[PDB]
Structures are given as structure tokens and as C-alpha cells.
Write a protein that binds this ligand. Structure first.
Ligand code: NAG
Ligand code: NAG
Ligand code: NAG
Ligand code: CL
Ligand code: CL
Length: 291
């Protein structure tokens, strides 16, 4: 009932404890348990100990973005069964989130983890988040996209993975993402995508793969994308020879909107758009399956 010194407390529209840009070193004590929204963004909170908000059982929105988060306890968010929105973004030194941290958050809808310097996504990190719809993981330091990382995210519609260093996409990286509408994998180091990586992405409408390291792409990887409407493949070292014929054939039938597919090789077809090429331009080689 009394508001912490660095905070503003009001009841409408939701019970809110707001303490942004107050130079707070840690989570302020005495936050009203009736709080539905807590805003602690813009401080210098470095650690989030266990049960830091356990008394706030009605908490649905928690902002911790733009702090100095270096360590989050695995039980930091226990008791927050009604939490819908969690923001931990803009904490470039966070590096690693404990795989148990998000467990039990069955009402979570949006999870902001953009710019957190995340080195990896540990096993079971997004386990049981069946209500999650928006997952922000851009501008981190990811080096892998392990199988079944998002297996339980059946309600996920937006997945942001751009601005990382993911080298490849394995077969079961995106298994279970039946509701996925937009998938942003641009500005990574993707050198190869498994032929069946997008098997469950039949409702996907937007796929960004530009600014990667793709020289070739099996046409079978695009086949499950029945609902695709937007595709970006530019800024990739595409090799426009015989190996590009399957991808070429698919692009000729694609009724959606695709970007340029710039040929890096051969020298003759440099920066020509692959989809705008004739079939005759795609003969001969320039190790692949057709040479
Ligand atoms: C949560 O909200 C309900 C309904 O308004 C209320 O009865 C309960 O006391 C609240 N919990 C806390 C910890 O304030
Ligand atoms: C997924 O969303 C739909 C509607 O948006 C909802 O009816 C359903 O309960 C959600 N699934 C889960 C597991 O929360
Ligand atoms: C693309 O990936 C290959 C390995 O598959 C690697 O040798 C090459 O350096 C990468 N290119 C860039 C620009 O990183
Ligand atoms: Cl400080
Ligand atoms: Cl399945």
C-alpha cells in the first residue's frame, strides 16, 4: 500500500508500480503485491534474485529492459503464473538465461530478449510456453539453432532471430511452430538449410533470409511454405548454375512477393536476378549434387 521512494503508484487502468530511470541498483523492495504492471526499465539493475516479484500474483506486465542485467535467477519469476508480457531486452551483458527461468509462465504472450548478448538457447528454455505469440531474439550472439528449441510454441506467430550468427538451420529447429506467421532469419551466417526445416511452417507468410551465407537452397525447403507471401533472399552469395535450377523453378511458380536473388557466380551473371533468368542460363557447373 505504500509506494517505494523511487516509484510512482497508480491504480488506473491497471495497478501500476513505475520506477524508470531512477538509477536503481537492484529491484526496489516494498513493491505493492497488488501490482498488475511493474516498470523497472532504464535503471542499473544487475541481478534478479529468486522470487523477486512472488507476492505480485496479479502481475501481467513486467518491464526490465535497458538495465545492467548480468544474472537472472532460475526462480526469479516464480509465482507469476498470470504474467503475459516479459521484457528483458537491451541488456547486452546478460549473455545467458537459465533454461528454467521461463518455466511455469503458461500465460506469457510476448517475450522480449532482443539485444541481450545471448550466447545460446539452452535446452528447455522455451518449454511449456504454449501461449507465447511473440518472441524477440534479434541482435544477440546466437551461434546455433538447436532442434526442438521452439517445440512447445504452438501459438507463436512472430519469431525474430535476425542480427545473430546462426550458421545453419537443422531439420527440427522450427518443429512445432504451426501458427508461425513471420520468421526473420536475416543478417545471420546461414550457409545451409535442411530440406525439411520448414515442414511445420505451412501458415508462414513472411520469411526473411537476406544477408546470409547461402550459395544454394534445395527447392524442397520452400515446398511446405504453402501460405508464403513474402520472401527475401537478397545479399546471398548465390551460385546460379545447375544447382539453382530447382530454386529457379520454384520462383517461377511463386505467386507471392520475392526479393532479388542476386547471382554472385558465375561472373557472367553477376548481380543478375536468378528468378529473371532463362532456364538456359542455368547449365553446367561453376561437390554439389549436380556436379
Ligand atoms: C489479485 O486480484 C484479486 C482480484 O482483484 C484480489 O482479490 C487479490 O487480492 C489480488 N492479489 C493481490 C496479491 O493483491
Ligand atoms: C492459442 O490461441 C488461441 C486463440 O488465439 C486460444 O484459443 C488458445 O487457447 C491458445 N492456446 C494456448 C495453449 O494457450
Ligand atoms: C560461408 O560458409 C562457409 C562454410 O560453409 C565458410 O567457409 C565461408 O567462410 C562462409 N562465408 C562467409 C562470408 O562467412
Ligand atoms: Cl550505476
Ligand atoms: Cl508436429
Amino acid at each position: 500500500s505504500p509506494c517505494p521512494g523511487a516509484c510512482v503508484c497508480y491504480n488506473e487502468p491497471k495497478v501500476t508500480t513505475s520506477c524508470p530511470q531512477q538509477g536503481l541498483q537492484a529491484v526496489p523492495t516494498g513493491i505493492p503485491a497488488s501490482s498488475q504492471r511493474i516498470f523497472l526499465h532504464g535503471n542499473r539493475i544487475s541481478h534478479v534474485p529468486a522470487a523477486s516479484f512472488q507476492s505480485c500474483r496479479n502481475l501481467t506486465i513486467l518491464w526490465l529492459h535497458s538495465n545492467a542485467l548480468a544474472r537472472i535467477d532460475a526462480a526469479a519469476f516464480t509465482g507469476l503464473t498470470l504474467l503475459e508480457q516479459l521484457d528483458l531486452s537491451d541488456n547486452a551483458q546478460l549473455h545467458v538465461v537459465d533454461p528454467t527461468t521461463f518455466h511455469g509462465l503458461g500465460h506469457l504472450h510476448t517475450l522480449h530478449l532482443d539485444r541481450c548478448g545471448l550466447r545460446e538457447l539452452g535446452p528447455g528454455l522455451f518449454r511449456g510456453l504454449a501461449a507465447l505469440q511473440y518472441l524477440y531474439l534479434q541482435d544477440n550472439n546466437l551461434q546455433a539453432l538447436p532442434d526442438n528449441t521452439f517445440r512447445d510454441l504452438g501459438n507463436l506467430t512472430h519469431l525474430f532471430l535476425h542480427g545473430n550468427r546462426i550458421p545453419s538451420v537443422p531439420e527440427h529447429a522450427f518443429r512445432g511452430l504451426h501458427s508461425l506467421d513471420r520468421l526473420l532469419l536475416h543478417q545471420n551466417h546461414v550457409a545451409r538449410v535442411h530440406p525439411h526445416a520448414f515442414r511445420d511452417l505451412g501458415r508462414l507468410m513472411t520469411l526473411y533470409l537476406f544477408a546470409n551465407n547461402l550459395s544454394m537452397l534445395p527447392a524442397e525447403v520452400l515446398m511446405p511454405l504453402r501460405s508464403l507471401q513474402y520472401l527475401r533472399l537478397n545479399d546471398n552469395p548465390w551460385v546460379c548454375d545447375c544447382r539453382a535450377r530447382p530454386l529457379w523453378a520454384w520462383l517461377q511458380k511463386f505467386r507471392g512477393s520475392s526479393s532479388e536473388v542476386p547471382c554472385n557466380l558465375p561472373q557472367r551473371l553477376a548481380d543478375r536476378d536468378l528468378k529473371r533468368l532463362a532456364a538456359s542460363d542455368l547449365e553446367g557447373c561453376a561437390l554439389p549434387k549436380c556436379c
